[PDB]
Amino acid sequence: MNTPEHMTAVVQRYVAALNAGDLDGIVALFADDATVEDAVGSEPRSGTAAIREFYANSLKLPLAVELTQEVRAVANEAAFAFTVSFEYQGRKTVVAPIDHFRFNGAGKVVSMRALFGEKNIHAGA
Amino acid sequence: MNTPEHMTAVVQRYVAALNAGDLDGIVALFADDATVEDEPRSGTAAIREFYANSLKLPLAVELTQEVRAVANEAAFAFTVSFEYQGRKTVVAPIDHFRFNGAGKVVSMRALFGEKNIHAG
């Protein structure tokens, strides 16, 4: 089982790498055969290459990412509340999802999902 | 699809029913084939027992951020506080609800670990 400290560390490493625009540091968190989802129902992206292309797209612009509460980490999973703020067709928008990571035994993330709706997408103005 | 409004309203009634200790109020939000987890428990009888156990100590329950609701799911951050033989505990989970087509909750999982159990 992963430790909760490891899992919490990965989540912090994830948020810092988002903020740094460290594409390759994000991918490094994920297993070879991980699956990522932008949003509930979005096309799942599986495998290192689909994951790098996903994160490359996510990082097409500078992101301001803030962890807004403690990470919840238990068993082989973590969930976290956060905000992602960036220029969306030239206007600053702040999206507040809750993400869910599951981890494999090697401690790499095997799955990510970000849960958010329309009411979680905000001006910040 | 469930509307995000309906799902957010259900989260709010869940929180309210926990604060009231209203076991039937809580159970009514769930489907008869729902499963719960803090080792899942499934079906009305087991969900009722789960919540009856959860309610032996009066709970003070508060949403701590806006609810995230989309598709047929919702997630929310909150606290549950209670007193026990001289000591207050505040637990801060993140919950996940899945809803059926009829708008009832079909699964809830409350996610929290040891660091999310706070000494009040």
Tab-separated table of C-alpha atoms in Angstrom:
chain	number	residue	atom	x	y	z
A	1	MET	CA	0.000	0.000	0.000
A	2	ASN	CA	1.269	3.401	-0.657
A	3	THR	CA	1.866	5.513	2.409
A	4	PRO	CA	-0.416	8.495	2.913
A	5	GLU	CA	2.722	10.655	3.171
A	6	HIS	CA	3.874	9.482	-0.187
A	7	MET	CA	0.506	10.069	-1.697
A	8	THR	CA	0.239	13.573	-0.181
A	9	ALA	CA	3.758	14.330	-1.463
A	10	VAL	CA	2.788	13.304	-4.974
A	11	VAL	CA	-0.209	15.561	-4.857
A	12	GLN	CA	2.040	18.472	-3.777
A	13	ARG	CA	4.575	17.474	-6.491
A	14	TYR	CA	1.688	17.482	-8.940
A	15	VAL	CA	0.481	20.990	-8.018
A	16	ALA	CA	4.050	22.426	-7.995
A	17	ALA	CA	4.817	20.829	-11.405
A	18	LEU	CA	1.564	22.389	-12.780
A	19	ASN	CA	2.700	25.737	-11.489
A	20	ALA	CA	6.291	25.273	-12.847
A	21	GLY	CA	4.943	24.098	-16.262
A	22	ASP	CA	7.099	21.005	-15.751
A	23	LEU	CA	5.468	18.689	-18.373
A	24	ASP	CA	7.955	16.029	-17.900
A	25	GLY	CA	7.803	16.221	-14.088
A	26	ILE	CA	3.966	15.689	-14.196
A	27	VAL	CA	4.252	12.632	-16.539
A	28	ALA	CA	6.867	11.183	-14.162
A	29	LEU	CA	4.173	10.863	-11.514
A	30	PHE	CA	2.056	8.553	-13.603
A	31	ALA	CA	2.417	4.831	-14.336
A	32	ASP	CA	3.171	3.704	-17.921
A	33	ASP	CA	-0.394	2.494	-18.322
A	34	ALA	CA	-2.189	5.184	-16.314
A	35	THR	CA	-5.495	6.711	-17.410
A	36	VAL	CA	-6.261	10.399	-17.136
A	37	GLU	CA	-9.518	12.239	-17.563
A	38	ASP	CA	-9.870	16.028	-17.882
A	39	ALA	CA	-13.436	15.821	-16.533
A	40	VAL	CA	-16.239	13.384	-15.883
A	41	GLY	CA	-17.125	11.885	-19.255
A	42	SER	CA	-14.122	13.314	-21.113
A	43	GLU	CA	-12.168	11.029	-23.446
A	44	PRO	CA	-9.810	8.984	-21.238
A	45	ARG	CA	-6.191	9.268	-22.182
A	46	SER	CA	-4.247	6.103	-21.489
A	47	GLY	CA	-0.495	5.437	-21.521
A	48	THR	CA	2.673	7.552	-21.147
A	49	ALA	CA	2.367	9.025	-24.623
A	50	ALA	CA	-1.370	10.000	-24.367
A	51	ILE	CA	-0.602	11.327	-20.875
A	52	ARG	CA	2.261	13.572	-22.190
A	53	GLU	CA	0.097	14.877	-25.016
A	54	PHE	CA	-2.755	15.602	-22.460
A	55	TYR	CA	-0.440	17.416	-20.096
A	56	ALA	CA	1.251	19.256	-22.993
A	57	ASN	CA	-2.220	20.551	-23.879
A	58	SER	CA	-3.051	21.402	-20.251
A	59	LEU	CA	0.198	23.382	-20.163
A	60	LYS	CA	-0.364	25.270	-23.464
A	61	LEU	CA	-0.583	28.265	-21.065
A	62	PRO	CA	0.858	29.234	-17.623
A	63	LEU	CA	-1.320	27.817	-14.784
A	64	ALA	CA	-1.795	29.224	-11.254
A	65	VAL	CA	-2.696	26.213	-9.088
A	66	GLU	CA	-3.449	26.418	-5.347
A	67	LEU	CA	-4.183	23.572	-2.996
A	68	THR	CA	-7.109	24.950	-1.011
A	69	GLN	CA	-7.476	22.359	1.732
A	70	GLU	CA	-5.553	19.422	3.273
A	71	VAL	CA	-5.094	16.312	1.011
A	72	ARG	CA	-7.235	13.331	2.016
A	73	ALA	CA	-5.045	10.287	1.586
A	74	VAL	CA	-5.930	6.697	2.547
A	75	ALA	CA	-5.529	3.163	1.313
A	76	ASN	CA	-4.158	3.512	-2.191
A	77	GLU	CA	-5.974	6.781	-3.109
A	78	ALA	CA	-6.036	10.564	-2.488
A	79	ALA	CA	-8.512	13.332	-3.113
A	80	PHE	CA	-7.815	17.046	-3.075
A	81	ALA	CA	-9.622	20.359	-3.488
A	82	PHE	CA	-7.797	22.972	-5.538
A	83	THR	CA	-8.134	25.818	-8.018
A	84	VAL	CA	-6.649	26.179	-11.451
A	85	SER	CA	-6.499	29.681	-12.845
A	86	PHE	CA	-5.405	30.629	-16.319
A	87	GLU	CA	-6.262	32.681	-19.386
A	88	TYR	CA	-9.233	30.979	-21.192
A	89	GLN	CA	-9.451	32.584	-24.623
A	90	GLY	CA	-7.833	35.637	-23.072
A	91	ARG	CA	-9.904	36.004	-19.909
A	92	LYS	CA	-8.737	34.957	-16.360
A	93	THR	CA	-10.977	32.121	-15.189
A	94	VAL	CA	-10.601	30.128	-11.935
A	95	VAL	CA	-11.842	26.511	-12.005
A	96	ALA	CA	-12.273	24.772	-8.546
A	97	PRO	CA	-12.339	20.973	-9.000
A	98	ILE	CA	-11.896	18.090	-6.577
A	99	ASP	CA	-9.432	15.558	-8.045
A	100	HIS	CA	-9.143	11.878	-7.249
A	101	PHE	CA	-5.888	9.898	-7.701
A	102	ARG	CA	-5.495	6.167	-7.392
A	103	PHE	CA	-1.995	4.795	-6.974
A	104	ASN	CA	-0.339	1.449	-7.999
A	105	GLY	CA	1.883	-0.530	-5.757
A	106	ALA	CA	5.007	1.158	-7.152
A	107	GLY	CA	3.483	4.458	-5.934
A	108	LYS	CA	2.822	5.969	-9.400
A	109	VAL	CA	-0.598	7.387	-10.084
A	110	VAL	CA	-2.640	4.890	-12.141
A	111	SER	CA	-5.728	7.075	-12.546
A	112	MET	CA	-6.669	10.596	-12.220
A	113	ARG	CA	-10.251	12.196	-12.458
A	114	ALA	CA	-11.144	15.880	-11.911
A	115	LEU	CA	-14.745	16.472	-10.803
A	116	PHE	CA	-16.169	19.983	-11.435
A	117	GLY	CA	-19.322	21.559	-12.871
A	118	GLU	CA	-20.435	24.866	-14.272
A	119	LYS	CA	-21.002	26.348	-10.795
A	120	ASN	CA	-17.280	25.711	-10.090
A	121	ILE	CA	-16.003	27.900	-12.904
A	122	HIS	CA	-15.499	31.465	-11.601
A	123	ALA	CA	-14.486	34.967	-12.779
A	124	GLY	CA	-12.054	35.895	-9.907
A	125	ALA	CA	-13.110	39.510	-10.703
B	1	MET	CA	-29.187	13.205	-16.498
B	2	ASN	CA	-29.501	14.504	-13.010
B	3	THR	CA	-29.242	18.241	-12.812
B	4	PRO	CA	-26.290	19.639	-10.800
B	5	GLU	CA	-28.937	21.656	-8.823
B	6	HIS	CA	-30.681	18.477	-7.714
B	7	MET	CA	-27.461	16.827	-6.741
B	8	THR	CA	-26.195	19.905	-4.772
B	9	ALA	CA	-29.626	20.086	-3.013
B	10	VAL	CA	-29.276	16.451	-2.017
B	11	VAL	CA	-25.820	17.117	-0.571
B	12	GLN	CA	-27.301	19.930	1.430
B	13	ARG	CA	-30.202	17.792	2.727
B	14	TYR	CA	-27.698	15.006	3.604
B	15	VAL	CA	-25.658	17.460	5.705
B	16	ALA	CA	-28.805	18.792	7.319
B	17	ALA	CA	-30.151	15.343	8.148
B	18	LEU	CA	-26.748	14.368	9.720
B	19	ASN	CA	-26.931	17.540	11.883
B	20	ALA	CA	-30.477	16.675	12.925
B	21	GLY	CA	-29.671	13.045	13.583
B	22	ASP	CA	-32.615	12.188	11.340
B	23	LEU	CA	-31.826	8.583	10.293
B	24	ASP	CA	-34.921	8.241	8.006
B	25	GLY	CA	-34.080	11.629	6.392
B	26	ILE	CA	-30.621	10.405	5.483
B	27	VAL	CA	-31.798	6.981	4.274
B	28	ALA	CA	-34.438	8.487	2.076
B	29	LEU	CA	-31.798	10.137	-0.158
B	30	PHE	CA	-30.435	6.729	-1.115
B	31	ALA	CA	-31.624	4.065	-3.540
B	32	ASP	CA	-32.668	0.691	-2.142
B	33	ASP	CA	-29.682	-0.936	-3.807
B	34	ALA	CA	-27.179	1.823	-2.772
B	35	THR	CA	-23.763	1.017	-1.283
B	36	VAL	CA	-21.940	2.988	1.434
B	37	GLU	CA	-18.249	3.125	2.621
B	38	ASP	CA	-16.186	5.268	5.108
B	39	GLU	CA	-15.790	-3.323	3.228
B	40	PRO	CA	-18.926	-1.769	1.554
B	41	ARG	CA	-22.433	-1.947	3.078
B	42	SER	CA	-25.339	-2.316	0.576
B	43	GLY	CA	-29.104	-2.100	0.540
B	44	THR	CA	-31.511	-0.182	2.851
B	45	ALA	CA	-31.081	-2.344	6.036
B	46	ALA	CA	-27.295	-2.093	5.981
B	47	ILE	CA	-27.284	1.591	5.107
B	48	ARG	CA	-29.733	2.268	7.981
B	49	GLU	CA	-27.469	0.396	10.409
B	50	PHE	CA	-24.402	2.233	9.126
B	51	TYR	CA	-25.984	5.572	9.756
B	52	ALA	CA	-27.490	4.536	13.063
B	53	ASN	CA	-23.959	3.726	14.212
B	54	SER	CA	-22.701	7.057	12.743
B	55	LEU	CA	-25.298	8.896	14.768
B	56	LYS	CA	-24.663	7.454	18.282
B	57	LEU	CA	-22.741	10.653	18.974
B	58	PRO	CA	-24.442	13.830	17.926
B	59	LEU	CA	-22.641	15.249	14.845
B	60	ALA	CA	-21.985	18.816	13.823
B	61	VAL	CA	-21.571	18.695	10.074
B	62	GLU	CA	-20.627	21.619	7.780
B	63	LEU	CA	-19.780	21.950	4.122
B	64	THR	CA	-16.483	23.739	3.921
B	65	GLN	CA	-16.424	24.547	0.140
B	66	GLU	CA	-18.788	24.702	-2.763
B	67	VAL	CA	-20.211	21.365	-3.945
B	68	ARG	CA	-18.756	19.937	-7.271
B	69	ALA	CA	-21.651	18.446	-9.238
B	70	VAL	CA	-21.627	17.236	-12.849
B	71	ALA	CA	-23.039	14.390	-14.886
B	72	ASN	CA	-24.499	12.008	-12.299
B	73	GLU	CA	-21.952	12.690	-9.594
B	74	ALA	CA	-21.051	15.056	-6.853
B	75	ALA	CA	-17.999	15.555	-4.578
B	76	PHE	CA	-17.780	17.782	-1.523
B	77	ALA	CA	-15.370	18.824	1.254
B	78	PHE	CA	-16.762	19.086	4.732
B	79	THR	CA	-16.189	18.468	8.434
B	80	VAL	CA	-17.876	16.218	10.944
B	81	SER	CA	-17.260	17.250	14.629
B	82	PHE	CA	-18.330	15.330	17.781
B	83	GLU	CA	-17.460	15.195	21.462
B	84	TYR	CA	-16.525	11.974	23.312
B	85	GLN	CA	-15.554	11.467	26.952
B	86	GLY	CA	-14.081	15.012	27.255
B	87	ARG	CA	-12.476	15.358	23.809
B	88	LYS	CA	-13.645	16.956	20.483
B	89	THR	CA	-12.733	15.345	17.240
B	90	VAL	CA	-13.063	17.108	13.857
B	91	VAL	CA	-12.858	14.755	10.838
B	92	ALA	CA	-12.418	16.406	7.382
B	93	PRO	CA	-13.315	14.088	4.596
B	94	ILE	CA	-14.063	14.502	0.934
B	95	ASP	CA	-17.200	12.606	-0.075
B	96	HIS	CA	-18.151	11.257	-3.443
B	97	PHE	CA	-21.815	10.560	-4.341
B	98	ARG	CA	-22.981	8.715	-7.461
B	99	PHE	CA	-26.652	9.154	-8.448
B	100	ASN	CA	-29.062	6.922	-10.317
B	101	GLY	CA	-31.294	8.102	-13.194
B	102	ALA	CA	-34.150	8.619	-10.742
B	103	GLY	CA	-32.053	11.072	-8.704
B	104	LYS	CA	-31.354	8.872	-5.650
B	105	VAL	CA	-27.836	8.286	-4.305
B	106	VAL	CA	-26.495	4.816	-5.453
B	107	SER	CA	-23.114	5.032	-3.838
B	108	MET	CA	-21.356	7.260	-1.254
B	109	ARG	CA	-17.682	6.898	-0.255
B	110	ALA	CA	-16.213	9.116	2.377
B	111	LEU	CA	-12.508	9.541	1.914
B	112	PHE	CA	-10.299	10.537	4.830
B	113	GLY	CA	-7.241	9.159	6.444
B	114	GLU	CA	-5.454	9.502	9.702
B	115	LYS	CA	-4.190	13.095	9.085
B	116	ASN	CA	-7.772	14.160	8.399
B	117	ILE	CA	-8.775	13.160	11.942
B	118	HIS	CA	-8.134	16.224	14.041
B	119	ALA	CA	-8.010	16.497	17.874
B	120	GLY	CA	-10.536	19.379	18.060
